[PDB]
């Protein structure tokens, strides 16, 4: 509970970060007001991949950057390894016709 207490004079504007857990604010002698944040990130998770990418990046940034990093690393490693395998097979099958 990142409790912030401030004495406020005059007409100002204050920014607070609400999560799915919720945030409760008390303003003067008023009764406490509790609010909750729901997953309303911009984009559509059901449309094109770029909209899904920006939506899930706005939802959870570290998980999204690490899963796209995993996808990129996995496809790069797979293509490199299978290119090495194809080159191995190519030169192995081309050397009996290369000695003769």
């Amino acid at each position: 509970a990142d409790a912030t207490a401030e004495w406020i004079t005059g007409t100002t504007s204050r920014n607070f970060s609400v999560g799915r857990e919720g945030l409760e604010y008390v303003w003067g002698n008023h009764e406490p007001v509790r609010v909750w944040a729901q997953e309303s990130a911009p984009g559509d998770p059901h449309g094109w991949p770029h909209e899904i990418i920006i939506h899930y990046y706005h939802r959870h940034p570290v998980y999204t950057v690490i899963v796209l990093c995993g996808v990129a690393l996995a496809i790069l490693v797979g293509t490199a390894s299978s290119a090495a395998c194809i080159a191995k097979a190519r030169r192995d099958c081309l050397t009996p016709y290369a000695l003769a």
Partner: protein
């Protein structure tokens, strides 16, 4: 029937369940945690407040000298001043010229308004949870209040309920707390007998009307400069005022999991930090025979306009082919989607509508009208409202939070890479045969 389940600790958000005896029709079970309170075992270490620092009348003795003994009064500081000349109204108070001796006394004692403006220092041990439960079964609503520590049938009527242990008790109060005027603070107050001048606990007593009061204020007695009969003293500032100036904020504004602190007794009510296992020995009076319950024949849910949010942003319609007349319940069997109604009256071959809350982009879930299960799918949309006024009905699941389409491209890229590895290895095999 003994039914075991696990309900969230969150006050409000009523919880759905479906009990199914073998020889009886399925029956609703609605568990609502209407209230809760963590009441820890506390003991009074001491009470502290202002000091009156009463100074008695000086004892001037003359043509000689006197010495003062120690006393059991709180913070007894005593000094003897020689070579004085006490001069009250009317002249010199004795006749021994510049050999006169004066005794000056000083001790502290509780202020007259310490009955209200006082701070009680308490040690807080582990806390036992009360939970008030509203149980709706078999069209009947019952209110009850039980312990959570385990094996405590504190319910009434024919409902026996047992609340299992808390998954992880969090104990919002620290080991040491200070209660002043209905406000609770987490302060590491010094122990009984341990006391500093100008700090909290400068004066100490078991009660406000206790003779045994102990204090160590930095009080000290000074030689009277002016020829009068005053007692000049300098004393350290009260630690009560110093702590009041910089107490910070109380527990009512600094508390994890959003639950409010009350006094007499010290409690933290409506705490939302886990799950309670509930075992219910539901009676057989609410159970109805399967033959007398109107069973359905074939259903299929076709949801329209799903929006996954904290509210009930769903509307699925069921197409029932029931045979007899009456009502018999509904229940969503997924941990990600929770229905709104409990029972629905079914006539024959008709259509009903229901509302559900979910947190997943897809709603691929099983709804069991009256016992017979039937799953259906959805393509739900994110909500427009950023901030919403009531808490979420369900919890996000890591498998369900990924949408079906995004799941499809993730397994598409992963399976393309994997099949590319497989074709690489079989190309290696076809190279190895030659």
């Amino acid at each position: 029937f003994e039914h075991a389940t696990t309900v969230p600790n969150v006050p409000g958000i009523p919880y759905k369940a479906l009990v199914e005896r073998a020889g009886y029709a399925p029956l609703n079970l609605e568990i609502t945690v209407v209230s809760s309170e963590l009441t820890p075992s506390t003991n009074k270490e001491y009470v502290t407040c202002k000091f009156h620092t009463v100074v008695p009348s000086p004892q001037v003795k003359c043509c000689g000298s006197l010495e003062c003994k120690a006393s059991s009064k709180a913070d007894y500081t005593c000094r003897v001043f020689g070579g004085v000349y006490p001069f009250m109204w009317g002249g010199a108070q004795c006749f021994c010229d510049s050999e006169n001796t004066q005794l000056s006394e000083a001790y502290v004692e509780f202020a007259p308004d310490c009955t209200i403006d006082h701070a009680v220092a308490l040690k807080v041990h582990t806390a036992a949870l009360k939970v008030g439960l509203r149980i709706v079964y078999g069209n009947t609503t019952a209110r009850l209040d039980t312990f959570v520590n385990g094996v405590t049938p504190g319910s009434s009527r024919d409902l026996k309920v047992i609340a299992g242990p808390i998954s992880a008790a969090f104990s919002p109060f620290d080991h040491k707390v200070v209660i002043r005027k209905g406000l609770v603070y987490n302060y590491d107050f010094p122990e009984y007998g341990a006391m500093n001048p100008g700090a909290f606990g400068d004066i100490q007593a078991s009660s406000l009307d206790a003779t045994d009061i102990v204090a160590r204020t930095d009080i000290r007695l000074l030689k009277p400069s002016v020829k009068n009969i005053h007692v000049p003293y300098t004393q350290a500032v009260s630690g009560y005022e110093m702590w009041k100036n910089n107490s910070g904020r109380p527990l009512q504004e600094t508390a994890p999991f959003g639950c409010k602190i009350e006094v007499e007794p010290l409690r933290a009510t409506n705490c939302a930090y886990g799950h309670i296992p509930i075992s219910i020995d539901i009676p057989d009076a609410a159970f109805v025979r399967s033959s007398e319950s109107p069973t359905i024949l074939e259903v299929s849910c076709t949801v329209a306009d799903c929006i996954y949010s904290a509210d009930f942003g769903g509307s699925l319609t069921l197409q029932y082919k029931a045979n007899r007349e009456g009502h018999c319940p509904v229940h969503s069997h997924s941990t990600t989607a929770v229905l709104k109604e409990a029972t629905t009256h079914v006539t024959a071959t008709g259509s009903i509508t229901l509302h559900f809350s979910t947190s997943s982009p897809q709603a691929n879930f099983i709804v069991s009208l009256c016992g017979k299960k039937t799953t259906c799918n959805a393509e739900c949309k994110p909500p427009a409202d950023h901030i919403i006024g009531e808490p979420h009905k369900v919890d996000q699941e890591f498998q369900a939070a990924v949408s079906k389409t995004s799941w499809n491209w993730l397994l598409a890229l992963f399976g393309g890479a994997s099949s590319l590895i497989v074709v690489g290895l079989i190309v290696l095999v076809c190279s190895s045969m030659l």
